[PDB]
Amino acid sequence: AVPAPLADLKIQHTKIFINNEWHNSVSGKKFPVLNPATEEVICHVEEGDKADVDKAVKAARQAFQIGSPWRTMDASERGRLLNKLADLMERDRLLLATMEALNGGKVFANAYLSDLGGCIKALKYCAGWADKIHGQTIPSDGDIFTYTRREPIGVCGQIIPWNFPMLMFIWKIGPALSCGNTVVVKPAEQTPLTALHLASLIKEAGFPPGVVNIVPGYGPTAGAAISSHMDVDKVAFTGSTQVGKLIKEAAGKSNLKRVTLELGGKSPCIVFADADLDIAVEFAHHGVFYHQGQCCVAASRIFVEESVYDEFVKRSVERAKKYVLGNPLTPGINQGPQIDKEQHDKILDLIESGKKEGAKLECGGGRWGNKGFFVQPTVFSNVTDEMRIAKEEIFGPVQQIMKFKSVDDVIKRANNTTYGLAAGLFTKDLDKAITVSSALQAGVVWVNCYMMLSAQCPFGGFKMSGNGRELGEHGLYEYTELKTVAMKISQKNS
Amino acid sequence: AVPAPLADLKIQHTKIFINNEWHNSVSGKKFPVLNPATEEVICHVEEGDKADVDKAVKAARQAFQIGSPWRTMDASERGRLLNKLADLMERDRLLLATMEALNGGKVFANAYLSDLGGCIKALKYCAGWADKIHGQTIPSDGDIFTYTRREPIGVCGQIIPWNFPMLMFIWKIGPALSCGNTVVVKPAEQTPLTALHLASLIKEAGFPPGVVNIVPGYGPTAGAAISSHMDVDKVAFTGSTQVGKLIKEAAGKSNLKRVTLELGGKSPCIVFADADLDIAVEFAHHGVFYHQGQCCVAASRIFVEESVYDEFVKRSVERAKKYVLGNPLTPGINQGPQIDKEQHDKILDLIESGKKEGAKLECGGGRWGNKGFFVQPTVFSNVTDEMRIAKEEIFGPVQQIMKFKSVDDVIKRANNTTYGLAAGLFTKDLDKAITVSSALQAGVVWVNCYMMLSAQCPFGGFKMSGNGRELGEHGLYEYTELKTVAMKISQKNS
Amino acid sequence: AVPAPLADLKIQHTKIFINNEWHNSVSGKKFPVLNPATEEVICHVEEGDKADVDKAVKAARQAFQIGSPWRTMDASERGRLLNKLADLMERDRLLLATMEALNGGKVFANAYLSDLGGCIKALKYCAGWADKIHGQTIPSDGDIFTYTRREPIGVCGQIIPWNFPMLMFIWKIGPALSCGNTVVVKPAEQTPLTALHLASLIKEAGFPPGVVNIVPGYGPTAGAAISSHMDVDKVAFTGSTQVGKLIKEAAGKSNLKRVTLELGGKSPCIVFADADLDIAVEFAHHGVFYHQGQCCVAASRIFVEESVYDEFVKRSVERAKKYVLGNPLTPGINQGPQIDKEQHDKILDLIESGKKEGAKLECGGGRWGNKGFFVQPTVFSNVTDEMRIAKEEIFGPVQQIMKFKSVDDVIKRANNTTYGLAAGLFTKDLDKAITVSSALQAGVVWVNCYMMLSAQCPFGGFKMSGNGRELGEHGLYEYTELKTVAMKISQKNS
């Protein structure tokens, strides 16, 4: 049951959001927002830069001051506000789903059922934590009374990527707001609209002014202004590894702000001969092709046991036939475009690279259509570990199938990346499922499924796939700062 | 590496332990402690009663007063004292292992390696918890500061069985003492000696007087006195289901005291055709025969899928013929006696009942020797659910094997008991292991193993197998009382 | 900002609620429900008995079977339903507030603002916990993977009092459902109406059938059937100490169910000379007089330091003469009636006891009116610890003012009654606040306030004031049963 997309979609909010009112950019500058499906300009957005971030950081810092409403209201009240924001999003579900599909080239049915549904489920999950974050009373040595407080950190800068604009938006501000921080959010330049529309809803729900500030713009101007800012307490960033490296370096040189990073993945799936081959093919296929492969956790290398390798490749190639490229808003369409020309060129150069190296093409390998950034779902088999397609983050509807015979060998090969973050494991054997998932150097391990993202589980990576976990009970505490209070008393009793 | 037993063993502590002092019973009566197998009298120990329990409760309440040493010392010191008791136990490992094997008819190598080893490891675990028990600072509504305190409960009466005197003793006092309680223990009438000897070690370790009190004597005289006492704050009891009913009932009538019960089981094992046959046979055997089948959690019913049923029975009988009965102190002896004649007659009546009810006797069925309480390792096959041996806790070296063909049938049949203490599950399939263990109404579910009892895990009984769990993080907190403190403040901030 | 009460209030639901349908009593008997202000019959309710509880327990057991919707739905889904119940309660706030006031003689403004507000707030708090209840993965010894599961217990019988029918209702069912249990509720005979109306709303929110059952009736028939039922896993009971003794005893006599009790109190207030006397008087008055002094946490003993004793009594008498008694639905009325004639008799007799005991009666001391059960707000001074009013919970608008001069003695005196549910402490000294509240034997200690019972804090009981806590994080976990799963593995890694 999916309604049709809002026929006449109007872009209403295009300005900077600070202190619950809309601002022009200090520079007077605007910048175009494209439609990755048609290459036509949807609208123009005010272009924030360092000065606009300064306005936004002062707003948030002021909203965080001792005694001000956001600091003095009940924690459950912060929950009710987050719950109400979820209800507003449920009411405005069709609008947002249309805007997300239109602007981010996302298949509409997916934007409506999974993106928005996940946004609402995650916000309600975070809403529930607000008055359940607790500190401890500790029975430490001596005649003293020791307790801790889980206080909000302060001003949190949050840089959102373009592949899941609303989901990442909610996954970042939900925990931050639940813990009582205030935020300055910089959405990706390719996809600012859905965040700006959510800002109008944040206004409607009654969050105190300055608690949420949104400054759209480019990375090397507004993202950098956030990361090197001297009055920002934490920056959270999801995106490429190289920019994340720049973020930790800028934070270290600026004011030693806390940093959490979520970098890309080269996430492996291991398919054992004793796996349910249909479930394995369906989930591995889903894991690399969902949202045109632009997921953080894309299953970009699939290791299959030699006994079942040929049958697996056959079915994988058989499954890629069902895709239908075109406008994400048209019914029946399965696969939208990649977000822009930079990614389109990157993916195409990689597919050409795989062909030059020893690699077997089973389907795809080129672009699709004359307008938009479309890539045929491509499946490479006989991939070896030394190929570019086997080492570089693809972020495209390209599947690499590899072979393995030994358990130890595939564990070493799978872990032999600088990425951690995620992995897939398919087996019906109890021992192997446990021992292998223990051995994989990955932040999330799915067994006999893939990309089952929920709000109750913490998600984050090992190695250079990131810093920190988001959206768990553990994810919520990463937005608190611990304070120990130790009060001298005359005599302590247990 | 097992040493020989203390050659000529002398028992030095036979009186009541109160306020770190040895006492005669108020009446002066003493009672005999027997040696299973030889049926000889080891010595006579003071018989505790209501007058004695009253002395002990008075001591425990004094030791618990606000401002006393046990209440004002650092939690870490309570831990260090627990740690000191553990080292003392290790120094005296050989002595205590002999006394345990002598008094409880326990195979000496078993008492020395597993009983003493487990006691020391559990004492060290509880020691580690003493200063890590914490309360919470809670962000409740309104301008208030709310926190909780995990106070000790108070005076805890603890009634110990005869099957594992030392392990059960440490499992009760360890958590209780770690949290800062004071305790009055009534060890089993059959096996009081080892507990008394630990009492001497408790004095040596430096525990304040009255923190640990031990009252040997009978169940219906000193245990009843503990359970119905008006100034005992909690009673913890391990034993029969009927005595547990009697204890909770008296607790209701006397003063609403906290109660924890650990009752018997009819703990079933499910062996699926996809199981590792030898692991299943070996572990099921261990779970039904360990310590002459008088085990806390004995695997009496073994349900095997028909495909594997006959092969399982074959290997089970082959493994059952590998025992050597006799004096637990003689080297080479595998099976000692049952703890006394009462248990011996019960087991034998059930064996014949099984044969008369039409169960196939595969090996065993009768007594051994003229002296002692010995039972030949017995294996019954073709057992049906309406058979008595399939319904009464045999608490003996008797194994019952049943057949099953349907998963839901066997889940229902294993759960169809008034007991829910433990369960065993044997499979190599991931899905069956997780879902079947979820459906089992058991406090502990072992998969492809059995009787893997560690200190880090709580054991929580279901249904009438008990009330509460011990020895985990959850077990330590059951010996605390929670206190909420709510302080009005002029203004609160997050 | 309190609207006018429903003039009409036609009472719709008067029957037994089982399986989302309405049932007459198996016997056909009904029983009358009074209006304590006018003593005229509001309506007749079906009189449930053992047979009706048996119907209800079977319904709840069926709803709890493995594979049922209540067992298989997502925990967040249970939360979603609890939240839907809260919104419905919000919609019917005016109706339910009128019904609460009509049936329980509660001042309408209080029922609308404080009772319903707390009911919605506690439900939303419980809603938020459903999917945040977690078990542990434990690093226990050996090549094992050990984890625990917090399962729902099963069928929970919940026996509700008459003083806060809706609040207690939500406090018992909110946690039990949040954890995934099913419940059989027995509301007080004097006050079944709001619970039955809540049931219709549970039907409307969409809870699966059998998850909530309500069997109105008397205590010694339907409450007893719950407490002694052979298929009920837990009973939670709020009420008198003597009946609590019966419930704990009955649970022991049949099937050893888990038990939680919250009994009366004789909660003390300690007022130190440096306390803010204005604030101390205001809160002490509120804590003893609120809802005609029928709270479990009534502050009926007030110890004032000699320095401030007379000034305190002066203001208490000034504040106590300020009530306007009458029908709780009429606007302006400050004090409603007692719940029924039995309590009216007891409280008046206690008033007579105090005067013949040589207590200085300052105001009140008699009946009010000639319709209903009204009691003049009474204040006694110069009360001694040996007086009847000083040991017995009066449950009426009777205030006892006492004197103390040394802290050590007054802590002794405050902790010296058979109840320890709660306490108040008024002082500006940091050391006094921490040390005295640590020394007070009470489940909740309020400092410089009283009766600020939020949904985030658990409020437990000491001594004979009960067993267990509710409505905290601690409170929710008591509606779970712990299960340890231990899976043998080929090799474990840290």
Add this chain to the structure above:
Amino acid sequence: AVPAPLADLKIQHTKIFINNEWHNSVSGKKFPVLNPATEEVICHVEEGDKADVDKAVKAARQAFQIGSPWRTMDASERGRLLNKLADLMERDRLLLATMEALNGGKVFANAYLSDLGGCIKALKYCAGWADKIHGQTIPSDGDIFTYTRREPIGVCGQIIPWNFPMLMFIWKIGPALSCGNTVVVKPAEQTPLTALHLASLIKEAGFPPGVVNIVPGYGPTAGAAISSHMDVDKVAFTGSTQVGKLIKEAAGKSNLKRVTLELGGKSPCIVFADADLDIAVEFAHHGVFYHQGQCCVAASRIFVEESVYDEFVKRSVERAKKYVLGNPLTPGINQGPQIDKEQHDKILDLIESGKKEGAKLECGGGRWGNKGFFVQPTVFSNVTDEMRIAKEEIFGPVQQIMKFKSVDDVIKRANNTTYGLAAGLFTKDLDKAITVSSALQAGVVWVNCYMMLSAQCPFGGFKMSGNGRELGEHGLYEYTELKTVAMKISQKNS
């Protein structure tokens, strides 16, 4: 009982410690270790560099590989090993205290009772945590079973300062080893000896080869080699702010390793008019001069309310004239030297800044003695906020006293730092104790005391005073990596 120091003290371990074997530096260079009291060379130590660090990281990485002893032993074993190291430290308590006192110019009595005692207590606390670190089982949406694992992070580099070399050594490796990491420690150039002697004790205790590696050397060679190493998973650092900036930057540029810094604050005290003047004086000095004011948490600003200002300064000057400067091992000496000449010049220039900027110095202000770097106990009065001594971090006995008139004025001035490590608060007022301590932007707030550190409380800072906590439950989890395992299952039950 404080014993006499080691007379015949031989330095035995002076080389690089890798794989439980002693190494010469790859270059063959040694570097001298001086005695800060006499400026005499104590000995020469192997000078580690990049090559020596690379060896240590290969050793630690190998010791961390799956299947290695350190990864496969029970967590409780890691605990027993740490406990044995503590017992060893207790046995060699006199040796370590003299070696520590001699090498770090620390008063012998302090090194023996406070430095060693804390090291042993901290180690035992960490030992207790090893097998109590747990993950969670989460009830997330869908037919899944989700759990988390708290794994060890991997190879941890730990860079130690010279002020509390043993204490800092223990605070870093104790938690790291409790969780199962392997570590490469780089002590300060000034104080490598006690770390090397503990390395020998770690061999004796039975730690597997490579789990603890120690590489002495200089900061910009050996520390830098650690922080930028591509195979080190975390760096923990205690030291100056401008080095922490460099470390955080090196981590970002190399392999985005985790970073935890503990920098040193300007920790302020608020002395209220109602404070206990004597104790405030005693503890406020205690906090800034302890160990010649080289403490991790120095009380470098003392704000006093006008009402008690002058008398407070008098007592401060009076108590400051009670010390005996000289050799720390000599009995009776109360104040030792600063660690070196570089520190000595920094301290003296700050005093010159103090006089020139116009603060009233009551005592001290110059060099002391003809040998060594000794600094007279200096007290400055009437200091203002923009003065170097009030804003530039002082490591020295220089004490700063100021006045305040409005409470928020002083809270602003106290929070007007880029440092938030600690704070002091002296008052008897319940409301101010809570409200002011919540308002202070500091990681630890002491009330009516100072520098009462412990192993049970988590320790770390706000703002530029560091990130992360040590030695708490929160401190132990900082050495773990979170992994979510999500296993799809056929049907889920609560």
